Amino acid sequence: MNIFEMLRIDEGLRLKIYKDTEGYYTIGIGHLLTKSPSLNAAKSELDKAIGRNTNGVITKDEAEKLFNQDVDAAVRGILRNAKLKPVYDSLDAVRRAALINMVFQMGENGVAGFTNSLRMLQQKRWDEAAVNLAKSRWYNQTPNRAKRVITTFRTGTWDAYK
Ligand SMILES: [Cl-]
Ligand SMILES: [Cl-]
């Protein structure tokens, strides 16, 4: 198991524009297109992202390409972030995957806001961190996925994904 397989399990793969859990236009492996309600604003972003007229449909390869960019950007955003970098540096390899997963789902700003949990993670207070991470809109809105990520932080193994 690695970050790619992990996020592939959490996000799924869809080759046609769809609506995410929040109701936003997305495609592929969790690639957010726009927060705008317009399907046309979505098709426009989609074509700009792929470099071809897609008519809202892409191939597996195209989807994986987007996914490769998104993970890369997630990591790089963590490394450039003053609040995130120190947490990431402190973690072991599995727990690092858990943080990258939160960032991919919610963006750097979103994660950087989990001040208290971040502090607990850095201090390696696993059980306490898991408890605080659960008191969030995140956990309430997508409980199955949140539980998987939280378990990864608590244990430091890939159990929840096996
Ligand atoms: Cl893009
Ligand atoms: Cl869920």
Give the distance (Å) from ligand 1 centre to CA of residue 151: 30
What is the pairing mode between strands 31-34 and 25-28?
Answer: antiparallel
| Known active-site residue 128 | no
49 alpha carbon – ligand 1 mean position (Å)? 5
**Secondary structure (3-state) at 16:** strand
Binding-site sequence positions = 32, 104, 117, 132
Rounded distance from Cα 12 to ligand 2 centre (Å): 12
Q: For residue 145, which ligand has an atom nearest its CA?
A: 2
CATH number for 54: 1.10.530.40
Catalytic residue among 20, 47, 64, 128: 20
- DSSP annotation of 159 reads G
Cα 70 to Cα 51: distance, rounded to the nearest angstrom:
16
Tell me the technique behind this structure: X-ray
| Angstrom distance (rounded) from CA 160 to CA 97 | 13
Q: What gap in Å lies between CA 77 and CA 48, rounded to an integer? A: 22
Domain membership of residue 38 as a residue range: 1-162
Helix axes 115-122 and 126-134, enclosed angle (nearest 10): 170
Helices (H) and strands (E) in the chain, counts: 9, 3
**Beta-carbon contacts of residue 49 (< 8 Å; ≥ 6 apart):** 31, 33, 66
What's the gap in Å between 48 CA and the centre of ligand 1? 8
- The Cα 42–Cα 40 span in angstroms is 5
Strand-strand pairing, 31-34 and 14-19? unpaired
Number of domains present in the structure of the chain: 1
Binding-site residues for substrate, in ranges, read 32, 104, 117, 132
